[PDB]
Amino acid sequence: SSILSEVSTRARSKLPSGKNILVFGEDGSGKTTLMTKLQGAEHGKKGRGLEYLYLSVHDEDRDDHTRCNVWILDGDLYHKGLLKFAVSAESLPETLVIFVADMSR
Amino acid sequence: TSDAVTFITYVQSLKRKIKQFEKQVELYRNGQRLLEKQRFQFPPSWLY
Amino acid sequence: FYRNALTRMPDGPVALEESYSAVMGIVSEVEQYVKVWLQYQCLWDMQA
């Protein structure tokens, strides 16, 4: 049997995927505005709870486009449990944490 | 001094081929990156 | 306009969280169903 399977098993290489970005910013600190500006959209949606966006990243060297996960988290400690929802042990080593700090206040 | 001048004329001969090998490197960067975006199974013997 | 009902939750964030939970379930299964199926593409990568 196999053979077909084992020769299939020798996949040549891989491109990075499945990264993740987290954040906090106080309620309405333009954090949604920034995140939506990164992928180019003028504005997303200002809501409550954990939100979710993209980062389309393109490399001309690899000629590759990838979607980097963005988990923008709203303010208020009442949603702290969603962070238990927003991180796994396997997700941890692939997570880049951005913060927000507006100088309005 | 014969040995030194032999080495010198050898490296001078190398001087010309320097640029040819440079453009060889560039075009192979071209071809290799293309073959990657052409997604070919670079052999195990393939020298990176 | 009123944006506080989430803290006005009778049952606490659980009803929200379980909702999100369904999400993470569906998509997870979906990618699983994709993954093995997607595996077939490997056939091209291995030339005759």
d(C-alpha B31, C-alpha B26), whole Å: 9
Residues 6+ apart with CB under 8 A from A83: A73
Structural determination approach: cryo-EM
If interface means Cβ-Cβ distance under 8 Å, which residues of chain A face chain B? 12, 61-63
Contact criterion met (CB below 8 Å) for A99 and A24: yes
Residue A91's φ and ψ, nearest 5 degrees, are -75, -25
Q: Is the dihedral of CA A62, A65, A68, A69 positive or negative?
A: negative
d(C-alpha A87, C-alpha A32), whole Å: 20
According to DSSP, the residues that pair with A57 across neighbouring strands are A66
Instruction: Answer whether B26 touches A (CB < 8 Å).
Output: no
- In this structure, the number of other CB atoms found within 10 A of the CB of residue A73 comes to 19
Q: One-letter amino acid identity for A17? A: S
